[PDB]
Design an enzyme around this catalytic site. Structure first.
Site, PDB file in Angstrom:
ATOM      1  N   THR A   1     -54.096  59.784 -72.040  1.00  0.00           N
ATOM      2  CA  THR A   1     -54.436  58.470 -72.646  1.00  0.00           C
ATOM      3  C   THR A   1     -54.158  57.337 -71.652  1.00  0.00           C
ATOM      4  O   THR A   1     -53.095  57.290 -71.036  1.00  0.00           O
ATOM      5  CB  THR A   1     -53.638  58.266 -73.960  1.00  0.00           C
ATOM      6  OG1 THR A   1     -54.365  58.837 -75.046  1.00  0.00           O
ATOM      7  CG2 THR A   1     -53.418  56.801 -74.270  1.00  0.00           C
ATOM      8  N   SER A   2     -55.124  56.442 -71.495  1.00  0.00           N
ATOM      9  CA  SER A   2     -54.915  55.190 -70.780  1.00  0.00           C
ATOM     10  C   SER A   2     -55.297  54.032 -71.693  1.00  0.00           C
ATOM     11  O   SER A   2     -56.446  53.925 -72.136  1.00  0.00           O
ATOM     12  CB  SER A   2     -55.757  55.149 -69.520  1.00  0.00           C
ATOM     13  OG  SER A   2     -55.490  56.277 -68.728  1.00  0.00           O
TER      14      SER A   2
ATOM     15  N   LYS B   1     -59.883  54.727 -79.723  1.00  0.00           N
ATOM     16  CA  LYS B   1     -58.440  54.555 -79.666  1.00  0.00           C
ATOM     17  C   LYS B   1     -58.036  53.147 -80.069  1.00  0.00           C
ATOM     18  O   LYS B   1     -56.855  52.881 -80.292  1.00  0.00           O
ATOM     19  CB  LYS B   1     -57.913  54.907 -78.269  1.00  0.00           C
ATOM     20  CG  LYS B   1     -58.068  56.385 -77.928  1.00  0.00           C
ATOM     21  CD  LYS B   1     -57.490  56.751 -76.571  1.00  0.00           C
ATOM     22  CE  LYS B   1     -57.782  58.217 -76.259  1.00  0.00           C
ATOM     23  NZ  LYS B   1     -57.294  58.662 -74.923  1.00  0.00           N
TER      24      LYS B   1
ATOM     25  N   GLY C   1     -51.866  57.943 -68.502  1.00  0.00           N
ATOM     26  CA  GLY C   1     -52.660  57.431 -67.394  1.00  0.00           C
ATOM     27  C   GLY C   1     -52.154  56.141 -66.777  1.00  0.00           C
ATOM     28  O   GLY C   1     -52.517  55.800 -65.652  1.00  0.00           O
TER      29      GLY C   1
END
Ligand SMILES: [Mg+2]
Ligand SMILES: [Mg+2]
Ligand SMILES: [Mg+2]
Ligand SMILES: [Mg+2]
Ligand SMILES: [Mg+2]
Ligand SMILES: [Mg+2]
Lengths: 204, 233, 222, 250, 237, 196, 198, 235, 243
Positions: F1-2, F33, F130
């Site tokens: 996840t970023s 997200k 990330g």
């Protein structure tokens, strides 16, 4: 150790032409030690038959619980419970103890008294229904039973032939399992009559 | 008006009155007289103890709540025991958790709130006792009057119980003199002992009659009874 | 298990294989893994079999009661919200992994639910041990705006990939089609490409083969 | 916060009467007539929609309710009491039956549970009995069609035909005269319409009358196809138009 | 308490109001950027210690409450307001808006008119302060009824207080500074004491002002208090 | 996840990749997200998907009830409700949330609530597995009071790098723009951002 | 390990229970009666965890005695054992299970038959011609499979029992200090006081 | 719950008064069976005789009850009695002795008499049952929670009248068939209606099971009542 | 004073006096209200009376925003009104949380009626002395009006009115729908549906209104909002240039 392997025990049910059969061994053990030669694992509420394998304390308890529950059912409904309905009752009763389950493999056999259709079912210890029309197997020799049944079985068997098939399946599965056997009982269930036979088998 | 309205604490009269609370107030007037007064350095409780019989003990009116706080009672004595136990706990809680001596003002507020709940709950009665609370905290000497209605007032002096109106008028007149009695415990007790005399039809206050309590700048709350009061009679 | 969900232009289709297992052993060669939450909201599950059925029946029951209470058609977002909140409460212990699809007055919907209570939306999904085989087919052939016909074909082909390549999946393909205007169509054994061949021999025994010790008639009546 | 009436509000009087139950039964009497008639191949339950305002949309207030796919109910007495009893009856059909045996309760057992709920409002602390009488009609595989009345005391009785509310005495008379054991459902609906016209003051049409049947299975109301053993509800609410069709040849 | 009369009244609440009317008089005045609260403290006896039977209560840091009737009932209500304000601040981080706070007290007072096992409160409460979007003043009756006010008065001298309040609203329509409002509150309290002139009284003022107290609740004391008393003393004669 | 949120001249922008994994398998390549909890209050979630959804749903419920009673909640109020849930339940939660909001008074605001349940107000925030790879880049390239297009470029460049190095990040870059305007959804596909 | 044997002859049930109580490296007692009379025609023997053993026995005894007085009637052996099994079946799933195995020997007056029930701590019940708990069964079951007849007298049964105790004295690694033997028949319960040298 | 100055329980007495307006129920015990007969409360042409059971209920396979009073109160108690019989069966693996079941139910009624401020149940029961200890048995229980055993008994309306009649004609050496006749004659003599027709009756027996050695509860279908009413010469 | 007049038990006539007395409480504010359905909106109008010149007029209101989509106008004393408002807001928020969609107007009304039924049956609760009128543009049903009373009764309306002079307005409207033959107001703009509402109140009550005499709530697709004095002023001007 494994609660489903302490006591021993196998139950098999089969459908034929206008009949069902249900069978079990008679062994009650404590690991290697054989204790009772007379431990029956098949029960009947009216015309509905229930076999149970697994931990013997739970076999006994569930028999008493289903006798209890079907007695009340009959009083309120003013009729005996049917195979289909009872199957649902076993399922939700087992699932009720989802996180503290009874250590059992129940098997239901019978003929619906209205439609005359033969009925069998199986469950896991938490009440997941195995809906199969040919055979249901359970217990410490379930692998051996699946083998025998998948080989021996053909549909629409006459009660007198179905008797041989279910018996041969049970006997030979039992003989390859250290914890099963010690005698065997077979029920042939025809709408109108039910015959019970004790098989002659190896006593080792 | 007084008819179907004094059954419980949970019913107003058509006049907006709570009769159960007013009846609780009447148990105070039935009680034996006690006086309280203070200067800047000390606070004093004087109480007339009452016997049941000439063969009996005079019953105590003065209860210690902490080293810096205590009270006198007029009315139902067992109610005073309940309330002083609560006050003892509140004082204790304050020392343990905060290492802080409970302000006499906060003690007043706590008693008011406790009385109040009993003036609004069904099946419970109001408290039937009046209390005079004295203490020396971080802002000097204090005196409080508590009524079971939950009203608490801070005063230089006061009296509660039977015939207390006499003592009250005296203190009301004596005001400018006793407020100044600083650094002399014995003179303030004397002024208290004289105040309680204006409330006597009874008799002449004996060694058993008389109960005196003091607290102040360098004196823990202390109770005098028996031979220890003789020097004031 | 292989289960898939595929959205098409006027609705949604779910499909599943028909094999349940106890470890390496196949218990039921033709069981139904397609479950009704309500008439037009259907459901496929992987994981603990008893859990996926129970959670389906519980929420199904409550959705009926909600519908009766509100005088409205059950929505898919209601099934999803009740399922996820219930599964979440049980902190993964109820091992239900579900693809939930249906149609309601607000349109058509496709969701996945994981046993810890997380949800996802999408146009195509797979779950089960066979999900990677099925996803490889879906990723190869899915396109935007599919016809009903195309969507049935694709979902069916995804299940076959599961059936032929995943040891956890087998036997037949069941489909359910939920189209925005219409009643839902449940299509038991839409494909049957796994017919057992006739055996070489019959194993029926000459009567009397089994030795019997004793015998009796059993009383059923009273 | 907290109850001061933790005692029974229904008690026996010197003469043996249960006062609150009688008074509730009087509330039923003042209520709009409803009725039920049992046929060989169905049951009909019927009632009048006595509207409170002509500005009110009377289709938003159903007096006839589905309880299970094969069981419906109607009432005479206090509407809001009926409404909450319907919710509890629906719920108890699931919690005490369907979640146990995977099928809907037979009519007599569900009526039994509703009766129980009403009995408890007669014995528990701090409550008054429900001010309604219900007629409950249904079908089940092993008992066939049935019709039950449930009273504020929790008493229930099976009926071939009955009426409750305002003109129930005249209507029962009218039904005893007309009922027989060979009636088809259409004959029963016809009798239900005739019986109800005596009761109705104003307009008598498909918009002021409310009628439902427990008949044969409606596979078109099921919502899905593909499962042969599932055939659809037997409970069916007749439409305004369906009612007007039967009033022309009335 | 839970009893409706044949005409839809609640006699118990009407009786609770009589307890309020019997009480000391108290007021609130809304100024251009804050609120002023003032109350009459009856001097029962010389023995009462001056400045030491504080009636005006703070809730959180930015709300004041004054009340008339059964003083303990008012304290009970303020304890509840404090719990109610802490719980809002705990979850939402921001201090409770005055209208939000009003309803909290409102709902709580109304609850005590629903059940046969409880009596209504025997106070009316005047309260308010500054929040995100300005000053607010509220008055709350034993029935749980409350509205926003420009000025409010309750207790024995309520009638004359309301009349002086009404005059101010008329002569100052253009928003009355915090410093003027304090002076006027002293005046109005003096002018409701005419009824209870048999016994002497002590004046208590508090205020919450944006420019004068930074939106916090403060007690008016010292030179500011004396100046307000002198103004009232001059304007009474 | 970023995931990230950036304040700028006219408001705040939230960005995220769209990859969700279980192990090395991409369970969802097109995840959303960016989660709305009020009209102009949005958040990015990281950690356990079950936990962060359950939390976001509860917050949305609290803010809807708040709005009914008291009016528009501030971004700070939203962040405080998240913290309360994350702090008080720190022992059954694995949740890292970034809260981003716009109101007329306070303009654009960013709060981050990492694992412990602490709250931090910041001009911009980055989170998820990330983010570790872009601390250097973001610190060097972020400026206060950037324009919409500049901010969109900063997030696009930042997340493209986070995506380049993190196996758990990828797919499309989604963004939400939060201003007085307006709520604006933006999306950027691999063929654009990889060529940067 | 605790020897607990039962044998059902034609007209009686014989219980035999070891007399040792051993903790650690010390035999604390050599005369321990591992039995409670539940009713005049029902006897129960027990073995297992140190405290549980007597506590369970006495609890059961209390309950049967209560029944007898409330009903002025003696429960059949079948009924007592069903009640015992239930208690054990509940125990196994509770917080701390009773770790007790029991034998129940009764004379049923309504049927005129002796009855022997074996129940383990899980609540596994079975009616048997003869039974044992613990390691002792690993010797006695096979011995009795050989020597036991269904038509034996009480004296024949006591000989059969003597044979079982001899084998255990010969083969068991622990000194169990002989047994206390009790006979249950129509005339009630009695102790054979002579067995250590009969 | 409270006592009167007379030492009586108001609410209990008023409950008993309620029961004396309910249809008479009669129980008669013979050496080879028990009879239960009850009069249905003033009915109507349109009542469904076939699917109606308002006065007679099965408690288990060996025990039945006749009810006088509120039916809904009685169903409450009947249900717990059914549960109680099954708990006993589960515990002991034996059918519950009749007295044990009766005592339990009676204790429940007694409770409402002594604590909790709820009204008593407006129910009197006649219990008919068999067990291997006392053979055929007949008990009665009322709202006070008291219970007694009988050879013949009635509850509901006209108990006084019905009791005198039973006292006269009852004899210890009766067979069930004579007891069937006695119960119907007694109901016929004591009805407040013109004739005692089938549609106004519930009827049941507990016999030695046609031919077996087992016990059978026969709940009479309406048609059977019509026949047995001709046989005894009441038509 | 018998017990049957102090708590919600039946009188010998099968009546519940405390319920009946609660209906009488609903008029104690002497305010009238009416609701009408437009083509894609729903409008509530209520009188606003501010007798005391010390009151802040902006805080005097009997209209509440229950949710983004539902508005509620109350006829009854404010304390009971605010009790009902709070509950409805909580019920609405909770419905959305549990079932994943916005609570419909009619379902909220059914729920509030259900709560009112309880106060009718349990002794320790008194009924609330209020009548609640719920409005929205339902996503499934279009413009909606549902009204609940202290009896736990509720129904949907074409249009409705409540208050002491309820009948005047009711027959005025009954007469309109007799003429038009349809069950809503044809009109696309909410502004003209609001004007129709104000106009018909003026005829029925025979009274003129200023901008401070009125209170207006409007429900459209997805918002419900109230009008400020100025929006109402603009509405009063428009009616005057014709009527
Ligand atoms: Mg196995
Ligand atoms: Mg073997
Ligand atoms: Mg006032
Ligand atoms: Mg990547
Ligand atoms: Mg009530
Ligand atoms: Mg009350």
């Amino acid at each position: 150790s494994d609660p489903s392997s302490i006591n021993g025990g196998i139950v098999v049910a089969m459908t034929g032409k206008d009949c069902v059969a249900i069978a079990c061994d008679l062994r009650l053990g404590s690991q290697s030690l054989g204790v009772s030669n007379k431990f029956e694992k098949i029960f009947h509420y009216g015309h509905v038959f229930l076999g149970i394998t697994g931990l013997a304390t739970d076999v006994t308890t569930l028999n008493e619980m289903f006798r209890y529950k079907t007695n009340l059912y009959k009083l309120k409904e003013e009729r005996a419970i049917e195979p289909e309905t009872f199957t649902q009752l076993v399922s939700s009763s087992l699932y009720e103890r989802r996180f503290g389950p009874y250590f059992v493999g129940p098997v239901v056999a019978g003929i619906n008294s209205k439609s005359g259709k033969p009925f069998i079912a199986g469950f896991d210890l938490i009440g997941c229904i195995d809906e199969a029309k040919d055979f249901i197997v359970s217990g410490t020799a379930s692998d051996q039973l699946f083998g025998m049944c998948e080989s021996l079985y053909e549909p629409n068997l006459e009660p007198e032939d179905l008797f041989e098939t279910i018996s041969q399946a049970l006997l030979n599965a039992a003989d390859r399992d250290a914890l099963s056997g010690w005698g065997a009982v077979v029920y042939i269930i025809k709408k109108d009559e039910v015959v019970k036979r004790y098989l002659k088998m190896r006593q080792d | 008006f007084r008819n179907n309205y004094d059954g419980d604490t949970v019913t107003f009269s058509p006049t907006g009155r709570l009769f159960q609370v007013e009846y609780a107030l009447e148990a105070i007037k039935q009680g034996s007289v006690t006086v309280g007064l203070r200067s800047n350095t000390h606070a004093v409780l004087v109480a007339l103890k009452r016997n049941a019989d000439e063969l009996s003990s005079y019953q105590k009116k003065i209860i210690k709540c902490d080293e810096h706080m205590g009270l006198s009672l007029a009315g139902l004595a067992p109610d005073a025991r309940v309330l002083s136990n609560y006050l003892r706990q509140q004082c204790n809680y304050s020392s343990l958790v905060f290492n802080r001596k409970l302000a006499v003002e906060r003690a007043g507020h706590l008693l008011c709130d406790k009385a109040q709940k009993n003036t609004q709950s069904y099946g419970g009665r109001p408290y039937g006792v009046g209390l005079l609370i004295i203490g020396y905290d971080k802002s000097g000497a204090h005196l409080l009057e508590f009524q079971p209605s939950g009203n608490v007032t801070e005063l230089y002096g006061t009296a509660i119980g039977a015939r207390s109106q006499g003592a009250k008028t005296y203190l009301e007149r004596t005001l400018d003199t006793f407020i100044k009695i600083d650094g002399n415990p014995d003179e303030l007790i004397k002024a208290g002992v004289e105040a309680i005399s204006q409330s006597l039809r009874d008799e002449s206050l004996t060694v058993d009659n008389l109960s005196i309590a003091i607290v102040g700048k360098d004196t823990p709350f202390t109770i005098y009874d028996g031979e220890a009061v003789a020097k004031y009679i | 298990t292989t289960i898939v969900g595929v959205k098409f232009n006027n609705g949604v289709v779910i499909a599943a294989d028909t094999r349940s297992t106890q470890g390496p052993i196949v218990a039921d060669k033709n069981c139904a893994k397609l479950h009704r939450i309500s008439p037009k909201i259907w459901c496929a599950g992987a994981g603990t079999a008893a859990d996926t059925e129970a959670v389906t029946q519980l929420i199904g029951s409550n959705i009926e009661l909600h519908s009766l209470y509100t005088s409205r058609e059950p929505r898919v977002v209601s099934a999803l919200q009740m399922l996820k909140q219930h599964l979440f409460k049980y902190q993964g212990h109820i091992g239900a992994y579900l693809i939930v699809a249906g149609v309601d007055p607000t349109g058509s919907h496709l969701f996945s639910i994981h046993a810890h209570g997380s949800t996802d939306v999408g146009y195509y999904l797979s779950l089960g041990s066979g999900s990677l085989a099925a996803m490889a087919v879906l990723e190869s052939h899915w396109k935007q705006d599919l016809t009903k016909e195309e969507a049935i074909k694709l979902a069916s082909d995804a299940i076959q990939a599961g059936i032929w390549n995943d040891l956890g999946s087998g036997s037949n393909v069941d489909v359910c089609v939920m189209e925005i205007g219409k009643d839902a169509e449940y299509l038991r054994n839409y494909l049957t490409p796994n017919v057992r061949e006739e055996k070489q021999k019959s194993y029926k025994f000459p009567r009397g083969t089994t030795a019997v010790l004793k015998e009796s008639i059993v009383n059923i009546c009273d | 916060m907290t109850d001061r009436y933790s005692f029974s509000l229904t008690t026996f009087s010197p003469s043996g009467k249960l006062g609150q139950i009688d008074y509730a039964l009087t509330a039923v009497k003042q209520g709009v007539t409803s009725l039920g008639i049992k046929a060989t191949n169905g049951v009909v339950i019927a009632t009048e929609k006595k509207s409170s305002s002509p500005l009110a949309m009377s289709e938003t207030l159903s007096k006839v309710s589905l309880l299970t796919p094969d069981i419906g109910a109607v009432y005479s007495g206090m509407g809001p009491d009926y409404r909450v009893l319907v919710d509890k009856s629906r719920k108890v059909a699931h919690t005490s039956y369907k979640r146990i045996y995977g099928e809907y309760p037979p009519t007599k057992l569900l009526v039994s549970e509703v009766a129980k709920i009403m009995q408890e409002a007669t014995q528990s602390g701090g409550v008054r009995p429900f001010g309604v009488s219900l007629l409950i009609a249904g079908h089940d595989e092993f008992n066939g069609f049935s019709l039950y009345q449930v009273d504020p005391s929790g008493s229930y009785f099976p009926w071939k035909a009955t009426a409750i509310g305002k003109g129930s005495v005249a209507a029962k008379t009218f039904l005893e005269k007309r009922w027989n054991d060979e009636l088809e459902l259409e004959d029963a609906i016809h009798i239900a319409l005739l019986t109800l016209k005596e009761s109705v003051e104003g307009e008598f049409n498909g918009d002021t009358i409310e009628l439902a049947i427990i008949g044969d299975e409606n596979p078109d109301l099921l919502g899905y196809t593909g499962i042969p053993t599932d055939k659809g509800p037997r409970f069916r609410k007749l439409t305004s138009q369906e009612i007007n069709d039967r009033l022309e040849a009335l | 308490n839970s009893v409706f009369s044949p005409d839809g009244r609640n006699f118990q609440v009407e009786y609770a109001v009589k307890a309020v009317e019997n009480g000391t008089t108290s007021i609130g005045i809304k100024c251009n950027d804050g609120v002023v609260f003032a109350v009459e403290k009856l001097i029962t006896s010389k023995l009462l210690v001056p400045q030491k039977n504080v009636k005006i209560q703070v809730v959180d840091r930015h709300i004041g409450c004054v009340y008339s009737g059964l003083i303990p009932d008012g304290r009970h209500l303020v304890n509840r307001g404090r719990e109610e304000a802490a719980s809002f601040k705990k979850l939402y981080k921001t201090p409770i808006p005055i209208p939000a706070f009003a309803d909290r007290l409102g709902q709580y007072v109304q609850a005590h008119t629903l059940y046969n096992s409880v009596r209504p409160f025997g106070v009316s409460t005047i309260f308010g302060g500054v929040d995100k979007n300005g000053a607010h003043l509220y008055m709350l009756e034993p029935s749980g009824s409350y509205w926003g006010y420009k000025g409010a008065a309750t207790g024995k001298g309520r009638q004359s207080a309301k009349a002086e309040l009404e005059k101010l609203v008329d002569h100052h329509p253009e928003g009355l500074s915090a410093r003027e409002a304090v002076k006027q509150a002293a005046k109005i309290i003096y002018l409701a004491h005419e009824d209870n002139k048999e016994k002497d009284f002590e004046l208590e003022i508090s205020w919450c002002s944006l420019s004068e107290t930074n939106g916090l609740h403060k007690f008016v004391k010292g030179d500011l208090l004396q100046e307000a008393i002198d103004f009232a003393q001059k304007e009474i004669n | 996840t970023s995931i990230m949120a950036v304040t700028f001249k006219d408001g705040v922008i939230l960005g995220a990749d769209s990859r969700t994994t279980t192990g090395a398998y991409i369970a969802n390549r097109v995840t959303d997200k960016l989660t709305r909890v009020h009209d102009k209050i949005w958040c990015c979630r990281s950690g356990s998907a079950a936990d962060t959804q359950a939390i976001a749903d509860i917050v949305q419920y609290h803010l809807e009830l708040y709005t009914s009673q008291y009016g528009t909640p501030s971004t700070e109020t939203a962040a405080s409700v998240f913290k309360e849930l994350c702090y008080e339940n720190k022992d059954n939660l694995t949740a890292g949330i970034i809260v981003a909001g716009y109101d007329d008074k306070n303009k654009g605001e960013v709060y981050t609530i990492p694992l412990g349940g602490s709250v931090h107000k910041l001009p911009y925030a980055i989170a998820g597995s990330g983010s570790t790879f872009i601390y250097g880049y973001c610190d060097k390239n972020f400026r206060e009071n950037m324009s919409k297009e500049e901010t969109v470029d900063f997030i696009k460049h930042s997340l493209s790098q986070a995506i380049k190095w993190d196996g758990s990040s990828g797919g499309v870059i989604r963004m939400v723009v939060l201003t007085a305007a307006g709520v604006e959804r933006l999306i950027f596909y691999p063929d654009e951002y990889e060529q940067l | 390990m605790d020897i607990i044997l039962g044998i059902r002859v034609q007209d009686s049930v014989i219980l035999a229970s070891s007399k040792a109580v051993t903790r650690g490296i010390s035999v604390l007692k050599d005369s321990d009666d591992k039995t409670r009379q539940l009713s005049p025609h029902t006897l129960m023997s027990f073995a297992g965890e140190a405290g549980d053993t007597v506590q369970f026995a006495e609890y059961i005894q209390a309950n049967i005695q209560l029944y007898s007085i409330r009903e002025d009637y003696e429960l059949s052996p079948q009924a007592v054992s069903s009640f015992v099994r239930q208690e054990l079946a509940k125990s196994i799933r509770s917080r701390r299970p009773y770790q007790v195995n029991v034998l129940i020997g009764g004379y049923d007056k309504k049927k005129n038959k002796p009855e022997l029930y074996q129940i383990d701590y899980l609540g596994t019940k079975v009616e048997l011609p003869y039974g044992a708990h613990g390691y002792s069964g690993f010797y006695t079951f096979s011995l009795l499979d050989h020597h036991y007849r269904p038509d034996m007298t009480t004296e024949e049964g006591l000989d059969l029992l003597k044979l079982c105790v001899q084998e255990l004295e010969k083969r068991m690694p622990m000194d169990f200090k002989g047994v206390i033997v009790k006979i249950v028949d129509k005339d009630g319960i009695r102790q054979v006081d002579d067995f250590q040298a009969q | 719950t409270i006592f009167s100055p007379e030492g009586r329980l108001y609410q209990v007495e008023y409950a008993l008064e309620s029961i004396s307006h309910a249809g008479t129920a009669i129980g008669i015990m013979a050496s080879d069976g028990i009879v239960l007969a009850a009069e249905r409360k003033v009915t109507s042409t349109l009542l469904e005789q076939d699917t109606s059971t308002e006065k007679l209920y099965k408690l288990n396979d060996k025990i039945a009850v006749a009810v006088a009073g509120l039916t809904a109160d009685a169903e409450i108690l009947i249900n717990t009695a059914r549960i109680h019989a099954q708990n006993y069966l589960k515990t002991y693996n034996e059918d519950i002795p009749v007295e044990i079941l009766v005592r339990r139910l009676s204790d429940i009624k007694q409770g409402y008499t002594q604590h909790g401020g709820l009204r008593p149940f407006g129910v009197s029961f006649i219990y008919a049952g068999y067990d291997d200890r006392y053979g055929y048995q007949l008990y009665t229980s009322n709202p006070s929670g008291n219970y007694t055993g009988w050879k013949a008994i009635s509850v509901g309306a006209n108990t006084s009248a019905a009791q005198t009649l039973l006292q006269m004609d009852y004899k210890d050496d009766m067979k069930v068939d004579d007891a069937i006749e006695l119960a119907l004659k007694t109901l016929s003599k004591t009805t407040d209606s013109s004739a005692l027709t089938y549609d106004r009756l519930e009827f049941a027996t507990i016999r030695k099971g046609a031919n077996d050695g087992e016990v059978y509860q026969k709940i009479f279908k309406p048609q059977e009542i019509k026949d047995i009413l001709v046989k005894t010469g009441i038509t | 004073a018998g017990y049957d007049r102090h708590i919600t038990i039946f009188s010998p006539e099968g009546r519940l006096y405390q319920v009946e007395y609660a209906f009488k409480a609903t008029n104690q504010t002497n305010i009238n209200s009416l609701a009408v359905r437009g083509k894609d909106c729903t409008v509530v109008i209520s009188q606003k009376k501010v007798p005391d010149k010390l009151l802040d007029p902006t805080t005097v209101s009997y209209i509440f925003c229950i949710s983004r989509t539902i508005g509620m106008v109350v006829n009854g004393p404010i304390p009971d009104a605010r009790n009902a408002a709070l509950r409805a807001k909580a019920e609405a928020a909770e419905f959305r949380y549990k079932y994943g969609y916005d609570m419909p107007c009619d379902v909220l009304a059914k729920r509030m009626a259900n709560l009112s039924q309880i106060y009718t049956q349990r002794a320790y609760m008194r009924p609330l002395g209020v009548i609640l009128t719920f409005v929205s543009v339902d996503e499934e049903l279009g413009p909606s009006i549902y009204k609940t009373d202290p009896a736990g009764y509720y129904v949907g309306y074409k249009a409705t009115a409540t208050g002491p002079k309820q009948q005047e307005i009711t027959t005025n409207l009954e007469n309109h729908f007799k003429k038009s033959k349809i069950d809503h107001i044809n009109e696309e703009s909410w502004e003209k549906v609001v004007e129709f509402a104000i106009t018909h109140m003026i005829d029925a009550l025979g009274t003129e209104f200023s901008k401070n005499d009125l209170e207006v709530g409007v429900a459209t697709k997805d918002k419900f909002f109230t009008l400020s004095a100025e929006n109402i002023e603009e509405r009063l001007v428009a009616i005057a240039e014709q009527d």
